[PDB]
C-alpha cells in the first residue's frame with residue numbers, strides 16, 4: 282500500500298533547479314514526473330527530517346490545487362516523486378518572462394491558490410513558505426501549490442514574511458494568518474505584476490522596516506482594472522497585526538463573489 286517506490290524504477294533526467302533542501306529534476310516513473318532529491322552522498326541527520334516532513338505532509342494532500350504526490354524513494358537516494366507540470370512557476374511568468382495575463386485570469390489564479398491553501402488549512406497544514414515561487418501554473422491554467430519541506434501540523438524568502446515572522450517574537454509566529462499574509466503578497470504580485478518594495482535596493486533594510494512597521498507594500502500600484510473588492514481584500518490579508526487578517530474560508534468566498542460580477 283505504502284508509496285515507497287522500489288529502487289531502480291525512477292529515471293532521472295534534466296536538472297531544473299533548487300527547491301527547499303535538495304535538487305529537482307524532471308523524470309520518468311509511469312510517465313513524466315518531477316523528482317526532488319534532498320541528497321548527495323549520504324544525508325545530514327538534519328535533512329533526514331525535512332525529507333520525512335514533505336513526504337509526510339504531501340501524502341496527506343489529495344487535491345487538484347495541491348501538487349500531486351506520487352511516492353518517495355530512499356534506496357539509491359532520498360527522493361520525492363510528484364507529478365510533472367509542463368508550464369511554470371507563477372514567479373517565472375510574472376518576473377522573468379513577463380507573461381501578461383488578462384485580469385480575469387489573474388483573479389482565477391488567485392482563487393485557485395486560495396482554494397488550495399484553504400484545503401491545507403482545513404487539514405491543519407501550515408505551509409510556512411507560500412510564495413509565487415511555489416505556485417505552479419500547470420499547462421497555464423491550473424494552479425498547484427508546491428514545496429512542503431517546511432509545512433507543519435543559509436536562505437530566505439522574506440518578501441512574503443509577515444512582520445510577526447520577520448521578528449522572532451516567540452516560538453511560533455507561524456499561523457494560518459502568516460500564511461494569509463504570504464498569500465496577500467502574491468495577490469499583490471498578481472495585481473501589480475511587480476514584486477513588493479521594488480524601489481529599495483537593500484535587503485537588510487527591507488527586512489528591518491517590514492518588521493518594525495515602517496515599510497508596507499504600496500497599493501497605489503494595482504493595475505487600473507483590478508476590482509475594488511479585490512484591492513480591498515488584498516489590503517485585508519496584508520494587515521500588520523496578524524489577528525486582523527481573514528482566514529481562508531472568508532478569503533475564498535470573497536474572491537468567488539467578485540468573480541461573478543467581473544465578467545461584466
Ligand SMILES: OCCCc1n[nH]c2cccc(Nc3c(-c4ncccn4)oc4cnccc34)c12
Nearest residue numbers: 297298299300305315317363364365366427428
Ligand atoms: O522552489 C519551488 C519548490 C518546487 C518543489 N517542491 N517540492 C517539489 C517536489 C517535486 C518537484 C518540485 N519541483 C517542480 C518544479 C520546479 N521547477 C523549477 C524549479 C523548482 N521546481 O516544476 C515542477 C512541475 N511539476 C511538478 C513538480 C515540479 C518540487
